[PDB]
Structures are given as structure tokens and as C-alpha cells.
Amino acid sequence: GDNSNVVTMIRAGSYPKVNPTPTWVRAIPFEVSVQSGIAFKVPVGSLFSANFRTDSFTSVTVMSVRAWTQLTPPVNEYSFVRLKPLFKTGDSTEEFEGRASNINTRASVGYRIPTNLRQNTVAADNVCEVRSNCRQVALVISCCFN
Amino acid sequence: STGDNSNVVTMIRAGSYPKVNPTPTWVRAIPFEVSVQSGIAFKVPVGSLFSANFRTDSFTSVTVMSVRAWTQLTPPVNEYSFVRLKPLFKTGDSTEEFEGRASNINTRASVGYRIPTNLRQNTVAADNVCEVRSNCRQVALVISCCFN
Amino acid sequence: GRGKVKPNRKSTGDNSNVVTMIRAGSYPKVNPTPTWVRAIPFEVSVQSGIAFKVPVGSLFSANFRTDSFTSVTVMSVRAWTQLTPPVNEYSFVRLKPLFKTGDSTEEFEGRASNINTRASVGYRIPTNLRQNTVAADNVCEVRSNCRQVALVISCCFN
Amino acid sequence: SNVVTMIRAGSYPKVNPTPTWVRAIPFEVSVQSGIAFKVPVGSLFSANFRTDSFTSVTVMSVRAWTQLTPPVNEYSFVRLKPLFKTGDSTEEFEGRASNINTRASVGYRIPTNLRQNTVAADNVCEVRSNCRQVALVISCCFN
Amino acid sequence: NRKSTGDNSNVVTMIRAGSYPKVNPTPTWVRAIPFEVSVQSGIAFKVPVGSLFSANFRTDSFTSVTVMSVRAWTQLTPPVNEYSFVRLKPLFKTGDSTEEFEGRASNINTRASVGYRIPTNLRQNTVAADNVCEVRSNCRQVALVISCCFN
Amino acid sequence: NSNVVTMIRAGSYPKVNPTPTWVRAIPFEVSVQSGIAFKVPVGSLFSANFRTDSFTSVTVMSVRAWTQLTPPVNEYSFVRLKPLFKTGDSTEEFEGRASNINTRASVGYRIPTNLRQNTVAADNVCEVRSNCRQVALVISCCFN
Amino acid sequence: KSTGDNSNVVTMIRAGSYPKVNPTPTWVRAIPFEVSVQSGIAFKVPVGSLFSANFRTDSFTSVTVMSVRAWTQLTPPVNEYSFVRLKPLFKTGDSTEEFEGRASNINTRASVGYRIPTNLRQNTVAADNVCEVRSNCRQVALVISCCFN
Amino acid sequence: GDNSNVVTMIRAGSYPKVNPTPTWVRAIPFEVSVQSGIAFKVPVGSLFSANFRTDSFTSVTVMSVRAWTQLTPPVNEYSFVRLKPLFKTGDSTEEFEGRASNINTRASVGYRIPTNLRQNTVAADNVCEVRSNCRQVALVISCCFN
Numbered sequence A, H: 001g002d003n004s005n006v007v008t009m010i011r012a013g014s015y016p017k018v019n020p021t022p023t024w025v026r027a028i029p030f031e032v033s034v035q036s037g038i039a040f041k042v043p044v045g046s047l048f049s050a051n052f053r054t055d056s057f058t059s060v061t062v063m064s065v066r067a068w069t070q071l072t073p074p075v076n077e078y079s080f081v082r083l084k085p086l087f088k089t090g091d092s093t094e095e096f097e098g099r100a101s102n103i104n105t106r107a108s109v110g111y112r113i114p115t116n117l118r119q120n121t122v123a124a125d126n127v128c129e130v131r132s133n134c135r136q137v138a139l140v141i142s143c144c145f146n
Numbered sequence B: 001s002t003g004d005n006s007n008v009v010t011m012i013r014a015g016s017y018p019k020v021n022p023t024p025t026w027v028r029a030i031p032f033e034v035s036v037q038s039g040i041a042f043k044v045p046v047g048s049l050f051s052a053n054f055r056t057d058s059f060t061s062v063t064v065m066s067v068r069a070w071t072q073l074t075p076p077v078n079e080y081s082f083v084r085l086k087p088l089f090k091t092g093d094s095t096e097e098f099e100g101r102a103s104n105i106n107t108r109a110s111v112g113y114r115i116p117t118n119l120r121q122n123t124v125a126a127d128n129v130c131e132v133r134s135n136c137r138q139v140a141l142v143i144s145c146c147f148n
Numbered sequence C: 001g002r003g004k005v006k007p008n009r010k011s012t013g014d015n016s017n018v019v020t021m022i023r024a025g026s027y028p029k030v031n032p033t034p035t036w037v038r039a040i041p042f043e044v045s046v047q048s049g050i051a052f053k054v055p056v057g058s059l060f061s062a063n064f065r066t067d068s069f070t071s072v073t074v075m076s077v078r079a080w081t082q083l084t085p086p087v088n089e090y091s092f093v094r095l096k097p098l099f100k101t102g103d104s105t106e107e108f109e110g111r112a113s114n115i116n117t118r119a120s121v122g123y124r125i126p127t128n129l130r131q132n133t134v135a136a137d138n139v140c141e142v143r144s145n146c147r148q149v150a151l152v153i154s155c156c157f158n
Numbered sequence D: 001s002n003v004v005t006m007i008r009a010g011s012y013p014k015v016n017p018t019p020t021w022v023r024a025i026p027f028e029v030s031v032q033s034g035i036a037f038k039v040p041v042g043s044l045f046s047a048n049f050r051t052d053s054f055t056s057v058t059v060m061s062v063r064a065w066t067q068l069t070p071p072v073n074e075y076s077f078v079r080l081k082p083l084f085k086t087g088d089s090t091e092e093f094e095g096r097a098s099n100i101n102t103r104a105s106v107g108y109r110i111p112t113n114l115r116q117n118t119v120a121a122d123n124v125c126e127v128r129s130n131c132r133q134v135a136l137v138i139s140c141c142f143n
Numbered sequence E: 001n002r003k004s005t006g007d008n009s010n011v012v013t014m015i016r017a018g019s020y021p022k023v024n025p026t027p028t029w030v031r032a033i034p035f036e037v038s039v040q041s042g043i044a045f046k047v048p049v050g051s052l053f054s055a056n057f058r059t060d061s062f063t064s065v066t067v068m069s070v071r072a073w074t075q076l077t078p079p080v081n082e083y084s085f086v087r088l089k090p091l092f093k094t095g096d097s098t099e100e101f102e103g104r105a106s107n108i109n110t111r112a113s114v115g116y117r118i119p120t121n122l123r124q125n126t127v128a129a130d131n132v133c134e135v136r137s138n139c140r141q142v143a144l145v146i147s148c149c150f151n
Numbered sequence F: 001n002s003n004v005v006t007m008i009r010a011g012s013y014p015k016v017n018p019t020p021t022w023v024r025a026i027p028f029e030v031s032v033q034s035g036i037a038f039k040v041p042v043g044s045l046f047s048a049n050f051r052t053d054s055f056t057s058v059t060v061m062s063v064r065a066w067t068q069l070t071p072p073v074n075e076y077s078f079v080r081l082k083p084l085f086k087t088g089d090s091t092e093e094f095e096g097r098a099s100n101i102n103t104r105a106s107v108g109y110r111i112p113t114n115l116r117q118n119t120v121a122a123d124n125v126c127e128v129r130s131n132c133r134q135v136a137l138v139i140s141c142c143f144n
Numbered sequence G: 001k002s003t004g005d006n007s008n009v010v011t012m013i014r015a016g017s018y019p020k021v022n023p024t025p026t027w028v029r030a031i032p033f034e035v036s037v038q039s040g041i042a043f044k045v046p047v048g049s050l051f052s053a054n055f056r057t058d059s060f061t062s063v064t065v066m067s068v069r070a071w072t073q074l075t076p077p078v079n080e081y082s083f084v085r086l087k088p089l090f091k092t093g094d095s096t097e098e099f100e101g102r103a104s105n106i107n108t109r110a111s112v113g114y115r116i117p118t119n120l121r122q123n124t125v126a127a128d129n130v131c132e133v134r135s136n137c138r139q140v141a142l143v144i145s146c147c148f149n
């Protein structure tokens, strides 16, 4: 085992349980555009794409959302980014926020979804609202594609 | 059961932007069948492992680790099922004929072969995994592999 | 009844202050051209939106003392952005492995969190994919919003 | 692991495109009967050894073997007289064979306090032998 | 070191001196000498050993020095869009080297630093007319700190 | 130990000081006449002969004295030291005598920490007395 | 048996193959010799003084000096105590140290010495100098520890 | 303490006992020419030479003698060498002998001198007699020059 130099025989038995289309836990990176003073609803459909090897999925269970400002903030200001989670059974009002302490540095923050709120979404659903003084925010969403 | 968390969304104290990879690898084992004729060896093409039916249509290369085969249909009359595998390599084919036979005419014949580490390079669709032989008109394969 | 051969001022272990005699025996196995494990630093030019294939021929050069070699087994690749990024942006750098037996579709990426700082990333090659390459071969594709990328490749010249 | 992996690289490290490299250089020299031959350090800088990029080298120890057969009725012998730029030696480290068909061999170590750089124009040692060729193996540090 | 916990004498005390000792009015001195050198683009600058002998370092009484290690820092800002870098090539009277110890800054606003240690077998004296090393950089000045033994 | 140069992974520019302090033992001689005390000037400690011409101030810790020349005929050597200070001169006469006429006389005195302040070339360290015409001093001090 | 090792007659040595030899080996020595010194003038001790048949070292051409010790060889001036100074000399750069030793008895020698560090122990030839010697005495006795090669 | 890089001061004391011409223990290698069947008398004067750095000596105390055949033997023969110790108070009749088991290989033999016979010998003296079917013999004599 891990020590041979040639092919060896496998004494296979019965035909096992199979599944050609299994689930997949992923940390999907992508960016969204953000206007000043306006909240942007992140579509779940942005997680289904051939750029991520996920165009074969139609449902996803989101587990946590992390955000980073992707461009520089306005003059004289430090970057900030806010996140309001959204849920189909009822949206929240939390505004998890992070700010940069160095004007040249990104702002970041995230939120975890409790187990009791980890159901499936589809491309028409929205994950959360994003607010920032920077015109583009980079998101890394950890989720289970099924 | 105690070992849980909370019932509400919590805040994550994220740090710097991490290293990312939108197109990662995937250790998989693909199930698919191949048609085989009597007295004729069928070369299993690697392209069979790339398909939307397997969520692998974004990959172009794969590293095969082990191959297993079952007879998918019944054997001829009066006969028991058998299946054979001959590993094929771009750097040099083999001449091993890993064979399994059933001891019950109603039962599948099965066999497999592991690939050693020193022979675990990438293969593309134009390549072949192995030759298959059998007295049955179809063989079912399950190929453990690493897509990249 | 052995005794006395020659006096070479050998004091303690380390060290001695004069030349000493070595009791050489049979001629040993030798190799005038041995292998050499190295970490080669070099830069490449990159256009925005276009991938650049890093030629393995850049590793063989008199600037690295690697000019007698014709092959090289690459182990890992590391990349840093060598110039500043576009205005309002943070630096990023991507790497896609390339192999003669089959190119990969990974895009290992690293970004800067400070606009004044390099973006960095790398990837290790598994032992089962560590064969030799020649100058006509390519190591990996590189992408970046910066016009230059600094590469440091860990390899075994042979 | 059978597949590539991502390295979480940090800041650009300290690099050196032209390191030093420690070696054991093998090469032969031609020796005349009764005459001493000064081994040049330039024999160590050659593409035949991959060391052509260097111009200096610190020699650590010298080892010699007769490369051809000795004269009729004789046994092989080889001598070594170290040579330094600050002051040549008068030692004659000699080795003799006990079988006429076997090589003669000898070597000498250079002490730490005499391990400075040498250039191609300098000389390592003098070789004396009754055989027309001697095989040298010099352990040194190219820099 | 005496008592260390007992230094209480508030007045002069007598010293029972014996025989005249060995003396040396001009001893050695281990130092880390900081000084800068001007560098041009695409050109190596040979650092002269004479810069180590100066009244600005209390060392103008010396004429020889044994260098132990060299450390360099970029002293001015680098060109536009570039990260600072500096290279050192050791020089020796018995034979110049070809090593180019290089350090690069990862933040354009930060210095680039690198250094190299000399081994014991290469620690001999150097005089003003000698050179320490070659310095290469994209910045017009390089701050050096040379650890040495003035003797 | 290694036989070739090695790389140092330097970091941020350190704190530096091109003109540091120096703890020293300075040996010099003074001329002394019979029946009269010689005031040792602190300026004698600042000289290129000692590698201390760059200094203008020094903190003295202890003073040791030896007779440098032979004594008068029939006499044993003796040397005396009376400390001096800018805040208050002392009246101690630390004295040592030779028990062999062919041997030096020696003596010294330590300065307490509470009296270890700087002095300049103007100041004087101590008064020296001896029946010999020259005295050899070895003053331990801190240059700054 | 029979008096363990105390053999009273010749015995046979079962020699083997020929060993590595050297008719001209190195010799670590403490070489004593005197030098002539003037008043207020430094004398450069030549390395050639170490090569001589008086020391059995005339067959050597180089030598690695390890340390230098000096003693005044004659009496000092009237009223004075003996003293001797040593300033090391090196081919790569001369030292400015003046290691000094004085006598505390006028009838006794003054003495001092200095050690050379390993990194400065290279070979010297007859044209080289070891150090400068200063003294109020007119002759100084030296004992130089060195390795002949 | 140990790793000094600069010259350090030695606190020398009284002038020590000195000796410009000390003794020297040595292993002197030299060859002698021999005839067939004839015993050759090895002279002690062959140990005093500038080629051995010992021309300043005039006496030497020999401790042990070892001999190797320096040239090849006659055809059909294995090399041999004999040693007979010679002493100023009475020569010996011992013939310590060694023969080669390979015609291409040297023969060798030696003898140790007992402490009670280790007196000085001058140039005119003789160490031993040598007998060999080879025309040269290589001697290595461990002695104490004084």
C-alpha cells in the first residue's frame, strides 16, 4: 500500500451503492456591485455557474457569509461593509458591520446561519443585503451544494 | 443533543481576504457502463468520466486510482459470468488480465485493479483506461479517480 | 607491535592549525555533473485579462548557475505581484497548473488586503506528477491585474 | 496526496539566484618523472562540473590517486605539497601502493584558519609521481 | 558585580592596589557602524572600507577592521509602481564572490532589507583602500549597518 | 561553523548610535614634586593616544596610582591620593608605601555611585603626592 | 606472561601494507630569540628569525604564528622601571593595539604577550614581520608559539 | 572565552624554561639498495638528512624497524624480506622474516627494540642487516632524535 510499483488485483465483490450526482461543500468566491447608500440583494443564482463547477446544481444550503470590500473607499474615509441576512421564512434586521482601521485596507465581516435556519434556496432566492462605501464587495460564501 | 450552537445568526470576525480557488479538485468514483462483444476487447475511453451526468463536464484531466468492473447483464446459456481487465497506460500498456468469475450463473462476475502511485498521472478524453472482456454484453464500472 | 606512522598537528576535534594527512583508500564513485535542488527567482510580464504560460526554459540560465542542465523536476510554484495594481484596486494573482500528460483547470488565487501590498499564492505538485520538463514545456498559466509577477519555483535540476 | 494543492504563501522571501554550492570535483593532471606539477585552481571552473559560473572557491581537502600504471618493476607513489598564497608548505604527503597493479593514494586536509578563496591563477598543491597521470578529487566550496 | 544587592557605600573607599597591571591605551572595539551610500540605477556600488574609519563613529584612530556581517536597507523611496529591493555581492581580497543576496519589500511604502554573514575563515583585516561589497538597488540610497571588530 | 558566506534575513531598520559610550581603563603618567600636590586634570583622559578624542565628558569610577620612578636615596616609595569633586573636595589621604625600596608604592580609591557624575577637561580628578618624581595612574571610567 | 610488557629482547612486528608517510612534517614550537630595540623607536620583528638552524627550523619556509610573549632582556635606564610594548602586525592590515607590561621591581623583567585569533592565523614568510616592539630596555626576549609548515 | 575574533592580551609572567633545539619523535621513510642473497647493513647516518628535517641532530634512539620490499621479485618468486638487529653491545642472530602471498604484493616484517637496548646511535653505526630477493627495500624506522 502506497509502496507498490505495479498494478495489483482488487478482489471486488457485490456491486456497491452508487450515485453519479453527489453533493458538494464549497467556499464560493465572487463579487457584487454596490451603490452608495443603497442595499444590494445577493442572488443565490450567482452560486450556480460553470465558473465554480456548479452549473449542475439547482439548490444550495448556505452556511455562512463573509464579505470583503473589493475596491478603495471614498476620499478621507475608511472602508466599511454591512450584511443583513435574508430568509424566506422571515428576513432579519441585523446589520453586521466591519470597518477598516487603515484607509488602504479592506473592511470585512461575516455571519453564520444556525442549523435550524439551514434549508435549501434556489437561484431566485436572495442570501443577504450588502451595504458599503466601496463600489464592489468580494464575498466568500460557504455552502453545501445539493 | 447539547452539542449544538445557537438558534440565531451570529457575527463572524472575519480577517484578511483568504486564498481562494473557484475551480477546485474532486476525488470521485464514477459509475457507468460499457458495451462489450464476444471475443472482442473494448477499450474504455477516459472521456466517459467527463460528463454533466457526473457534474464533471468542467474538468478536462483526471488521475485514475483504481478500476472495478461488474457484469451488467446475464451470461450465455449454460455459462457463468466472467470479466477481465487489462490496464492501459500512455507510457506503456500492460499485459495483465485481471479476471473474476461468478460461482452462481445468476450472479455478477467482478474484478478490479489498483494503479500504483508512480503511474498516477493525468489522462484526457482521447486516452483509454483499460481493455475489458466478458461473455456478457455489458459491463458496469466504478472508477475511483481525482478530477483536476 | 604496531607503533608510529607520522605526526600531523591534530589537536582535539575542532580544530587544527596546520594541514593534516588523509589516509585515502580506493578511488570513490564520482559524478562531475550532479543534481541540484534550487529555489529559482524570476519575473514574467503579464497583460490584464490574458493568461501567460510560464516556459520551463526560464529555469535554465547562467543567471542561476543552472546552464548545464536540460531537465528539471518542479516541486512547487509561488508567485507574487511585482508591480502595483490599477488605480482603486487590490492586487491579485492566479496560477493554473500545466502538465504534459494533462493540464488542470484550477485557478489558485491570492489577493492583497492592502492596496500597497503584494498579492501572493502558490501550489504544490504531488509526487505522482513530479516528472521532468524541458525548456519547450510550460509550468503554469499566470493571471494578474499587475503588469509583472515575481515567481519563485522550487525544483530539482538534473 | 495525488493532486495539486494550494500554498498559502506570504510575503516575498529573501532570494539568491547565485548560491554557493559545496562540491567534490574530480579531474586528472599530467605528471612528468622527477618534476613537480602545480595544480591550477582554474581547473575547477568548467562547464564540465557545472561550476563555470563561479570565479572563487575555498578548498577544504585534496585527495589524489595515480591514474595510470607505474614503471616496470615499481610500485605506484603519489606526493602532495600544499600551496598557499600567504606561504607555501614544505610537506610531502606521500602514498605508495603495496600491489603493483593497484593505485597509490594520499590526501591532505586544509585547516579552518587557511580556508580562504582562490582564483584560477593560484595553485592548490604540487603533485609528484612515477605514474604519468594522477586523478584528483578536491572538496571545496564554490562562491 | 560585587553584592548587586548591597550597593550602600556613600563615600570613597580605599583600593588596596598591588602590582602595576598589563595595560593597552589603544584596545580593540566591536561596533555596528551605520552609514549610507548613494546608488545608481543598474549599477553596482563598491562600498569602501574607509567609510568605517571616521570621527563620526569614534573610529578615526583605527586603520584596520575585521568585518563580521553586513546588513543593508533601502534608504529612499523606490521608483513609481515598484517595490524596493537591494542586492549585496560580497567582495574579498583573496577572491570576489558572485552571490547576490537579495531582499525585496512587500509593501511599496516599506524598506527592502537583506544581509550576509562572513565565515570565520574569511575574517581577516581590511584597510581603507579595500572594498566590502557591491550594493545594487532601485533606490538612490542604501542604509548599511556593518558589524565589525576595529583593531 | 560554516566555511562560506550565509544570508541574514534582516528586518526593520534597528535603533542605531554611531557615537556610543565606552568603559575604559586609561593608563597615563603625571609629574609630581616633593612636598606639593599635583591636581590631575580630567583633560588628560581625552586624547587620541587613548581613542577618546571624540569625547568631551567622562564618568570616573575608581583611581589607581603607582610610583613610576625610584624614590630618594634611603627612602621607601609612597604615594597619596586625595579625591576632588565639584560639589565638595575631600580630605582623605589614601596612602600606600613600598616595603622594598626597589618596588613601587601603590594605592587607589573607589568613587561611590552617588558621586559618579560627569566631568570635563576643566575638572580635576584628585591630588597626587609622592616622594617619587612621576606617578602612573590607571583610571577606570565611562566615556560618554 | 613474564613481566607483562617489560620485554628484554627484540620482538617481531607483524607489519602490513605500506603506510602513508611524510618525510617533512609540521612542527609546533616555542621559539626563543632576542631582538635589539632603540629608545623611542619601534622594531619590526622579522619572521625570518624563526627560520634558522639554531632552532632546527631552517628546512621550513612558512610558519603560522599563534601567540607572542615578550620579556625585557637587559636592565632599564636609571630610576626607571622596565616596560615592553607589542603592536601586532598583519599582512591584511596592521593593528594599533599596544599591549604593554611594566615591572613593579626595577631589578625584574617587564613582560606582556598577545594571542592571535584563529581567523587571523595564516602563514608568514621570512619577508614578513610579526609585530612592533617598544621598550625602555635595549634588548627584549621573545618566545613565539607557532606552527612550522 | 573561546570564540575570539581579535587579538587578546596574554598576561605573561616570569621568563620560562626554554630550549631552542628539542628532541623529535619521528617515523623516517627511506629506501636502500640490495643484492640477491647478500645481507646489506643499514647505516644510522641515513636518518640524519635535510630531506627529513634532521640534519641538526647527531644522535638518535631507535625504537622499532619495519621493512617493505620496494621492487618486484625475481620471476616465479614471491617477495621476501629479512631483518637482523645489530647492536653496539652485541649483534643479534634473529632473522625476522616476512613473505608475500601474492607475487604482485610487497613482503613486510619488522622488529621492536626493548627499552633496555634503546641507547643512542651515531651516523657511523648500523641499524640492522636486510636480506631480500628484491633489489630495493623500503624502511620505516620509528626513532627519537636528540
Ligand SMILES: [Br-]
Pocket (backbone or CB within 6 Å): A004, A005, A006
Ligand atoms: Br513492485
Ligand SMILES: [Br-]
Pocket (backbone or CB within 6 Å): A008, A009
Ligand atoms: Br495478480
Ligand SMILES: [Br-]
Pocket (backbone or CB within 6 Å): A015, A016, A017
Ligand atoms: Br456499498
Ligand SMILES: [Br-]
Pocket (backbone or CB within 6 Å): A023, A024, A025
Ligand atoms: Br463533499
Ligand SMILES: [Br-]
Pocket (backbone or CB within 6 Å): A025, A026, A027, A028, B021, B024
Ligand atoms: Br471550495
Ligand SMILES: [Br-]
Pocket (backbone or CB within 6 Å): A049, A050, A052, A053, A054, A055, A056, B055, B057, B058
Ligand atoms: Br459545471
Ligand SMILES: [Br-]
Pocket (backbone or CB within 6 Å): A036, A037, A074, A132, A133, A134
Ligand atoms: Br459611499
Ligand SMILES: [Br-]
Pocket (backbone or CB within 6 Å): B006, B007, B008
Ligand atoms: Br439562541
Ligand SMILES: [Br-]
Pocket (backbone or CB within 6 Å): B017, B018, B019, D008
Ligand atoms: Br488563507
Ligand SMILES: [Br-]
Pocket (backbone or CB within 6 Å): B020, B021, B024, B025, D006
Ligand atoms: Br483549493
Ligand SMILES: [Br-]
Pocket (backbone or CB within 6 Å): B025, B026, B027
Ligand atoms: Br475532493
Ligand SMILES: [Br-]
Pocket (backbone or CB within 6 Å): A022, B027, B028, B029, B030
Ligand atoms: Br463520488
Ligand SMILES: [Br-]
Pocket (backbone or CB within 6 Å): B036, B037, B038
Ligand atoms: Br456479441
Ligand SMILES: [Br-]
Pocket (backbone or CB within 6 Å): B076, B077, B078, B079, B105
Ligand atoms: Br443456463
Ligand SMILES: [Br-]
Pocket (backbone or CB within 6 Å): B084, B097, B133
Ligand atoms: Br484474454
Ligand SMILES: [Br-]
Pocket (backbone or CB within 6 Å): B038, B039, B076, B134, B135, B136
Ligand atoms: Br461470449
